[PDB]
Design an enzyme around this catalytic site. Structure first.
Site, PDB file in Angstrom:
ATOM      1  NE  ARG A  75      -3.571   2.458   2.475  1.00 46.78           N
ATOM      2  CZ  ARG A  75      -3.626   3.279   3.522  1.00 46.78           C
ATOM      3  NH1 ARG A  75      -3.105   2.968   4.703  1.00 46.78           N
ATOM      4  NH2 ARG A  75      -4.232   4.436   3.372  1.00 46.78           N
ATOM      5  CG  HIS A 119      -1.784   8.711   3.128  1.00 46.86           C
ATOM      6  ND1 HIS A 119      -1.847   7.346   3.333  1.00 46.86           N
ATOM      7  CD2 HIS A 119      -1.422   9.255   4.317  1.00 46.86           C
ATOM      8  CE1 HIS A 119      -1.585   7.081   4.603  1.00 46.86           C
ATOM      9  NE2 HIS A 119      -1.330   8.223   5.227  1.00 46.86           N
ATOM     10  CD  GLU A 164      -5.964   7.406   9.306  1.00 49.59           C
ATOM     11  OE1 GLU A 164      -5.302   8.423   9.634  1.00 49.59           O
ATOM     12  OE2 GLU A 164      -5.836   6.299   9.864  1.00 49.59           O
ATOM     13  CG  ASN A 286      -5.773   3.081   8.427  1.00 52.82           C
ATOM     14  OD1 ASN A 286      -5.801   2.116   7.637  1.00 52.82           O
ATOM     15  ND2 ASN A 286      -5.347   4.290   8.062  1.00 52.82           N
ATOM     16  CE1 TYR A 288      -2.852   3.548  12.472  1.00 52.93           C
ATOM     17  CE2 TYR A 288      -0.686   2.957  13.289  1.00 52.93           C
ATOM     18  CZ  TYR A 288      -1.516   3.301  12.247  1.00 52.93           C
ATOM     19  OH  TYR A 288      -0.990   3.401  10.980  1.00 52.93           O
ATOM     20  CD  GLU A 341      -2.286   3.918   7.792  1.00 55.12           C
ATOM     21  OE1 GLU A 341      -2.063   4.367   8.945  1.00 55.12           O
ATOM     22  OE2 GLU A 341      -2.428   4.626   6.783  1.00 55.12           O
TER      23      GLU A 341
HETATM   24  O1  LIG Z   1       0.502   7.774  13.287  1.00 51.71           O
HETATM   25  C1  LIG Z   1       0.937   6.716  12.421  1.00 51.71           C
HETATM   26  C2  LIG Z   1       0.161   6.644  11.110  1.00 51.71           C
HETATM   27  C3  LIG Z   1       0.552   7.736  10.100  1.00 51.71           C
HETATM   28  O2  LIG Z   1       1.961   7.728   9.842  1.00 51.71           O
HETATM   29  C4  LIG Z   1      -0.244   7.504   8.800  1.00 51.71           C
HETATM   30  O3  LIG Z   1       0.122   8.355   7.714  1.00 51.71           O
HETATM   31  C5  LIG Z   1      -1.736   7.722   9.006  1.00 51.71           C
HETATM   32  O4  LIG Z   1      -2.454   7.096   7.953  1.00 51.71           O
HETATM   33  C6  LIG Z   1      -2.127   7.281  10.373  1.00 51.71           C
HETATM   34  N1  LIG Z   1      -3.352   7.381  10.888  1.00 51.71           N
HETATM   35  C7  LIG Z   1      -3.309   6.977  12.164  1.00 51.71           C
HETATM   36  C8  LIG Z   1      -4.502   6.907  13.089  1.00 51.71           C
HETATM   37  C9  LIG Z   1      -5.236   8.250  13.094  1.00 51.71           C
HETATM   38  C10 LIG Z   1      -4.434   9.448  13.601  1.00 51.71           C
HETATM   39  C11 LIG Z   1      -3.887  10.377  12.700  1.00 51.71           C
HETATM   40  C12 LIG Z   1      -3.162  11.496  13.152  1.00 51.71           C
HETATM   41  C13 LIG Z   1      -2.986  11.718  14.521  1.00 51.71           C
HETATM   42  C14 LIG Z   1      -3.534  10.792  15.419  1.00 51.71           C
HETATM   43  C15 LIG Z   1      -4.257   9.672  14.973  1.00 51.71           C
HETATM   44  C16 LIG Z   1      -1.999   6.624  12.451  1.00 51.71           C
HETATM   45  N2  LIG Z   1      -1.300   6.819  11.320  1.00 51.71           N
END
Ligand SMILES: OC[C@@H]1[C@@H](O)[C@H](O)[C@@H](O)c2[nH]c(CCc3ccccc3)c[n+]21
Length: 435
Positions: A75, A119, A164, A286, A288, A341
């Site tokens: 991706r 993105h 997102e 996605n 986390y 992700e």
């Molecule tokens: O934070 C790690 C990754 C980014 O490097 C990716 O580009 C992005 O798609 C992404 N989204 C998220 C979860 C949403 C989020 C975005 C910004 C700040 C906090 C949460 C985590 N991440």
């Protein structure tokens, strides 16, 4: 032992501005992340995407890393202003060529390209015309997407309109923490709405241009849990996939979003809902972290829990990925889902032995992969799983201070060092699951 379905797509994910560098090379236009990061105070340490992982030059090596790891899908995203320097009109052949070479190389190596159309690196030229605030972005985005489909849709068969859109709208236009750095709730909700319209227009053109492909959209998701015994219902509907999937599948925003946000939306926003319902092929989620949540007179605050946390300070809650996978089937039953992700930032160091012993990341990935497995066992049509990220990279407003990669990048030399987590993941991919 936890084996995944035959042909399950194990992947890694990146984004153009985070890895590429050379934002202005070969006739590219400025993006809003170029101008945002070159504005003092916006990004930790004044970091920018000027160099990043230098993937713009090192792309072949990086793909060779993917190949050597035996990872089956990549991706990556396309920089809109590399392709259309002014956002609309002129097409830059050299930007097309950059991604053509990536695409041909992946195919030759039997790696499946998943292309994220947007993105977050909007052309600066369109931001001057209001960017996501301007209804006309649905036309601009459709023209951009059409170019991509016309040029790459012969080879790329798996497409994502937006990464997102909640982040793009709310973090970019309400919180002011991401480009374009605004803090206006009315602009932020018009961006939500326009992102849907642009997404739907792009899908519509996809059907006219790529008759053998699949197209979806990616949402961020948190696992929200109540501190005691509704704030949770609101956080899920607003922060997770329902903000967008309720329009897409049901033709309106979710109920608690309307309660909070009706006044911020355009008055006749429902007029656009029929078109927003354009059929999609898959949903990417996605995921986390989890969040303890309580009512607090948006009437919600988070509560810190002990829990192990990553370097981002994000609570590690693996059952969250299971929950969100189950929940999306329960609520909208999309025909296919991908985890687009999943990953973790830890304070990685190169040991004296030349290795990066990121056991903390192995533990994180293993736990989540296991829960995604569980979801598959209970009927969730999960078709793939993408680790964020292939490489340590520019972490938006945190700059280079956060490393999410399964491959370490020494930015002084651009050397790549495969982390223990990368080696571990390659084994999972080869065995098609855990053991
Ligand atoms: O934070 C790690 C990754 C980014 O490097 C990716 O580009 C992005 O798609 C992404 N989204 C998220 C979860 C949403 C989020 C975005 C910004 C700040 C906090 C949460 C985590 N991440």
């Amino acid at each position: 032992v936890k084996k995944f379905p035959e042909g399950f797509l194990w992947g890694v994910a990146t984004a153009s501005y985070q890895i590429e560098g050379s934002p202005l090379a070969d006739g590219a236009g400025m993006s809003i992340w170029h101008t945002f990061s070159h504005t003092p105070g916006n990004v930790k340490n004044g970091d920018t995407g000027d160099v990043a992982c230098d993937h713009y030059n090192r792309w072949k090596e990086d793909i060779e890393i993917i190949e050597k790891l035996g990872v089956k899908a990549y991706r990556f995203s396309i920089s809109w202003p590399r392709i259309l320097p002014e956002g609309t009109g002129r097409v830059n052949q050299k930007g097309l060529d950059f991604y053509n070479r990536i695409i041909d190389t992946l195919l030759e190596k039997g790696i499946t390209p998943f292309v994220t159309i947007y993105h977050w690196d909007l052309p600066f030229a369109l931001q001057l015309k209001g960017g996501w605030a301007n209804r006309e972005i649905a036309d601009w985005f459709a023209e951009y997407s059409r170019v991509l489909f016309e040029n790459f849709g012969d080879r790329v068969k798996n497409w994502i309109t937006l990464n997102e859109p909640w982040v793009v709208a709310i973090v970019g236009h309400l919180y002011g923490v991401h480009a374009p750095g605004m803090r206006d709730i009315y602009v932020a909700f018009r961006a939500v709405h326009n992102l849907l319209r642009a997404h739907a227009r792009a899908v519509k053109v996809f059907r006219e241009t790529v008759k053998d492909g699949k197209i979806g959209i990616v949402f961020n998701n948190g696992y929200f849990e109540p501190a005691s015994e509704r704030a949770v219902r609101f956080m899920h509907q607003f922060n997770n996939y329902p903000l967008f999937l309720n329009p897409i599948y049901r033709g309106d925003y979710p109920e608690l979003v309307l309660e909070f946000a009706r006044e911020y939306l355009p008055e006749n926003y429902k007029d656009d809902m029929s078109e927003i319902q354009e059929k999609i092929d898959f949903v990417g989620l996605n995921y986390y972290s989890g969040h303890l949540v309580k009512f607090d007179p948006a009437k919600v605050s988070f509560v810190e829990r002990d829990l192990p946390k990553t370097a981002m300070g994000w609570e590690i809650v693996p059952e969250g990925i299971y929950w969100i996978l189950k929940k999306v089937k329960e609520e909208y039953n999309p025909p296919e889902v991908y985890i687009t992700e999943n990953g973790a930032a830890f304070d990685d160091v190169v040991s004296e032995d030349g290795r990066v012993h990121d056991q903390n990341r192995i533990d994180y990935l293993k736990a989540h992969i296991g829960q995604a497995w569980k979801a598959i066992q209970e009927g969730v049509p999960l078709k793939g799983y993408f680790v964020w990220s292939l490489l340590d990279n520019f972490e938006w407003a945190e700059g280079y201070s956060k490393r999410f990669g399964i491959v370490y990048v020494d930015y002084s030399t651009q050397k790549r060092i495969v982390k223990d987590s990368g080696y571990w993941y390659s084994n999972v991919v080869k065995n098609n699951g855990l053991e």
